[PDB]
Structures are given as C-alpha cells and as structure tokens.
Amino acid sequence: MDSVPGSLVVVGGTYEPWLPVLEKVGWRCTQVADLRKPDALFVETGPCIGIVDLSHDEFSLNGIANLVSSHKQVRWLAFIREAQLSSDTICQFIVNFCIDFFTAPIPDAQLLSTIGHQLGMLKLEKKVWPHFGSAGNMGLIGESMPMKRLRDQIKRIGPTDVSILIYGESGTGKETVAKAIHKTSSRAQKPFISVNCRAMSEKRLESELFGLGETEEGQQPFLLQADGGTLLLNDILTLPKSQQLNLLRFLQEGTVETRQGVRAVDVRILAANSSDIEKALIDGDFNEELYHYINVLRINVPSLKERASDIVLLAKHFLQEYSKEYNAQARSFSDDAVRGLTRYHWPGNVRELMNQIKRVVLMSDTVVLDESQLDL
C-alpha cells in the first residue's frame, strides 16, 4: 500500500524483461519512446527512478546526457540498460552519474537489489521537495526577464548551502539577493548577518573572527552569532590580508574564538563584490585560495541598464512606498516623468533610484510628479 514511480525510456516496447519484475512488485513504471517526449514527462513526474535504454539501440549520447542533467538533476536518479557493450566510449558515458547498469540476461531476484538501494533516496527527495516556489515574494526588487532568470536561479542555488559569490554593479541588490537565497536555503529560520567590510579598519575586522576585549565584555564575534545561518561579506576584496587569512582559516576548521573559550560554529559564507576581481587577483592583492573557496557558485545581479522595463515598476513601487509612509501627497508619475525615468542611465542603479525618489517625494508638493520635479 506504499510505493513510488520509476519510468524508463526505450524505442522497443518489446523490451519488457525488467518491467514486470518491477510491475508485479509494485512500481509505477511509465515508458517513453521519443527524445522530445521524455523531457516533458520528467518535468511532471518529479522525483522518480529513470532508466535509459542505451542498449545497442538508439538516442544521441549528447541528447541523453542533456536529458540526464537538463533540469532533472537529482529528481531523476540515473539508471541505464545495455546489450553488453563493455568496450568503447559508451562505458565512459557512465561518468554521467548513471549509478548502475543492466546486463543482457534477466536476473529476476538480483535486479531488485540494485534498484532498491535508490528507494531511500527517492523517498527523501519526495520529503525535501515541498520547498517548491512561492512567487519569490515579488522577487524582492522587481520582476521582468533578466530578473526572472535571476529569480529562477536564486531558487536553485539557495538550498545547496555552498558558498556563493554575489557580484554586480554597485547598489544593485546583491545584499537583498543574499537574504533571498538565505531564506530559500534549508537554514532559513536561522540568523542572517550582513557585514560591511569596506568601513572597518584591520583592527575592527580582527574583532570579527575572535572579537576583542580581554574579558567577556558582551562582545562575541560576528561568526558566533551567525551560527546555523548565513553571514554576508559585502565588498569582500576590501579585506586586509590578515583577515582574508582568518576567513580562509575559519572556512577550514569551522571555528571562531570567543572570550568564553574557542568555540566552533556553522556559517554559510556569502561574498559580495563590485570591483575588478581579476585585476585584484593577478596583481596578487587578493588570496586566490580564498577566492576559490568562495566562488563555488556565482550569481550576477543585473544593473538597471539591463532591466530597463523594470525601472517604471520600481519607481512606481518606491513612490507608493515613500508617499504612503511620509504622509506625502504624490500618487503617480506624469507620462512625462515615466518616459524620462527610463532615459536616465542610473549608475547607482536601484539605490540611486530609491534615494532620488525619496528626495522627490519629500520635496514635491503635487499629486502627480512631473519630469521637472525629478532630476533637477
């Protein structure tokens, strides 16, 4: 009265031999013949077992590899059937995490042994899947097309727990993106701690990996508080060599120093950056070993220049937000302002946008804001 689905892709539907030994033991085994079809089929079945009939048969090895990872990266669990082809390329093709294979004969009792191992995996996949989506909560800034690509990504790079380098132009949303992945992560209910490295002397930074005072003092390093959760370093290259070390050191031992004794913690480390990373690297101004520990995954937060259509939704949102907050009169932009609001280049991007609107709202006395009330 309890089981899980496991489908297979093959031309010859006469390739029964392994279907009934799964059917009569209770499997929801589905079968696809095309290469177009099983792509559609898998996006819908979610977590399942997927057998690929290489055999002596068909399908482009590229197309299969594509399919295997397309977006079916784990809710797929790879399995492959073949006509005893232990020789050429085909064997190397099981680098594509195809965990196991089917010999030509039909080992009825032995078959379930290999396939069964994955059941615990498919069951916990169905268990960790209800994270799903949630409209990304308005996408925390705006939502168009580079933003949709961003939104989609944040969802898929969130859960991993690996370090991510969040880079983009200055004042784009990098920190808000950090929070966005921290709440998508499996450590969302746990603390989040942004840190502005730029505005800290090398001695101030010291007070972050061991703290300061000779006594408890109520100090406690930033790493101690971020336990379980996620710490963020904005402008990460700004760090002094002495501190980059400690960052790396911590990234290996998973330990901080406290006045109440050295204690180990567990903090997912994210880094923000806006300056030329390569130039700092090649010159030897930023530890490369540190860079690699942090560049495990990358996310690019697009400048407003890229999401031009987003400005108007952003401006309107900021107006509605600031006006209703400051008792202000303004309720909308004149068509003049809008058609002018996109023409602006916006160096500081979303930051420069909110700040300038904050100024305009706090000053402008009309209900409709015109282009002349804006930039000047």
**What are the residues binding ligand GTP (CB under 6 A)?**
170-176, 194, 234, 272, 350-351, 354
Output the smallest distance, CB 185 to ligand GTP, in A: 16
Q: Using CA atoms, how far apart are residues 344 and 304, in angstroms rounded to an integer?
A: 10
Q: Which residue has the tokens 């101030």?
A: 204
The structure tokens listed for 164 are 């991510």
Q: β-strands 332-333, 230-234: how paired?
A: unpaired
* Cβ-based nearer residue to ligand GTP, 195 or 374: 195
Helix 61-69 / helix 37-45 crossing angle, nearest 10 deg: 20
The partner in contact with residue 273, picked from its own copies, ligand GTP, none with C-beta cut-offs of 5 to 8 angstroms by kind, is none
The partner in contact with residue 210, picked from ligand GTP, its own copies, none with C-beta cut-offs of 5 to 8 angstroms by kind, is none
* Cβ-based nearer residue to its own copies, 35 or 193: 35
* Cβ-based nearer residue to ligand GTP, 118 or 300: 300
Helix or strand run (H / E) with residue 108: helix 108-116
* Cβ-based nearer residue to ligand GTP, 126 or 351: 351
The structure tokens listed for 46 are 């979610």
CB 28 within 8 A of CB 59: no
**Count of CB atoms situated within 10 Å of the CB of 266:** 13
* Cβ-based nearer residue to ligand GTP, 170 or 219: 170
Q: What is the DSSP string of 204-254?
A: HHHTTTT-S-SS-TT---HHHHTTTSEEEEES-TTS-HHHHHHHHHHHHH-
Output the smallest distance, CB 141 to ligand GTP, in A: 6
The partner in contact with residue 91, picked from its own copies, ligand GTP, none with C-beta cut-offs of 5 to 8 angstroms by kind, is its own copies
* Cβ-based nearer residue to its own copies, 272 or 319: 272
The partner in contact with residue 288, picked from its own copies, ligand GTP, none with C-beta cut-offs of 5 to 8 angstroms by kind, is its own copies
* Cβ-based nearer residue to ligand GTP, 17 or 146: 146
Output the smallest distance, CB 366 to its own copies, in A: 31
The partner in contact with residue 1, picked from ligand GTP, its own copies, none with C-beta cut-offs of 5 to 8 angstroms by kind, is none
**What contacts 233, CB < 8 A, 6 or more positions away?**
195, 197, 239, 247, 269, 270, 271, 272
Strand stretches in 54-110, DSSP E: 78-81, 101-102
The structure tokens listed for 45 are 């079945």
The partner in contact with residue 171, picked from its own copies, ligand GTP, none with C-beta cut-offs of 5 to 8 angstroms by kind, is ligand GTP
Q: β-strands 31-32, 6-9: how paired?
A: parallel
The partner in contact with residue 244, picked from its own copies, ligand GTP, none with C-beta cut-offs of 5 to 8 angstroms by kind, is none
Output the smallest distance, CB 92 to its own copies, in A: 4
Output the smallest distance, CB 16 to ligand GTP, in A: 45
Q: Which residue is nearest to ligand GTP (CB)?
A: 174
